[PDB]
């Protein structure tokens, strides 16, 4: 039961993530997570980034996972779980445009 309410929602896709952040949720710099329906069932890291020239928006970072145990959105860095990686990304982005949720859903 990771944060289940900050940088990870559960088994969501990229369509619900884009309308989940823009449709009442948080400002930019908010990176949530969710299971990617692109592969058998990988993970994901949606992001919120509004702009002063079009409106709000939302990107995504498909998260992968080593069979040996290594959660990594980019092969440059993996971890043991999503709570442990949200722990490391909490202090750093890891390489993506922005790190996990910046503010606090609270």
């Amino acid at each position: 039961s990771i944060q289940a309410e900050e940088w990870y929602f559960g088994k969501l896709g990229r369509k619900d993530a884009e309308r989940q952040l823009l449709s009442f949720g948080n400002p930019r710099g908010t990176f949530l997570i969710r299971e990617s329906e692109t592969t058998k069932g990988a993970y994901s890291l949606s992001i919120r980034d509004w702009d002063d020239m079009k409106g709000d928006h939302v990107k995504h970072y498909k998260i992968r996972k080593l069979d040996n145990g290594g959660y990594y959105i980019t092969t440059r860095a993996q971890f043991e779980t999503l709570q442990q990686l949200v722990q490391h990304y909490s202090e750093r982005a890891a390489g993506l445009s922005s790190r996990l949720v910046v503010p606090s859903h609270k």
């Binding site: 990229r14 990617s36 994901s44 498909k62 959105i73 980019t74 440059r76 390489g95």
Partner: peptide, 11 residues
Amino acid sequence: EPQYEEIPIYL
């Protein structure tokens, strides 16, 4: 048709 941004690492 990109489905996700993959952090690169080339020169």
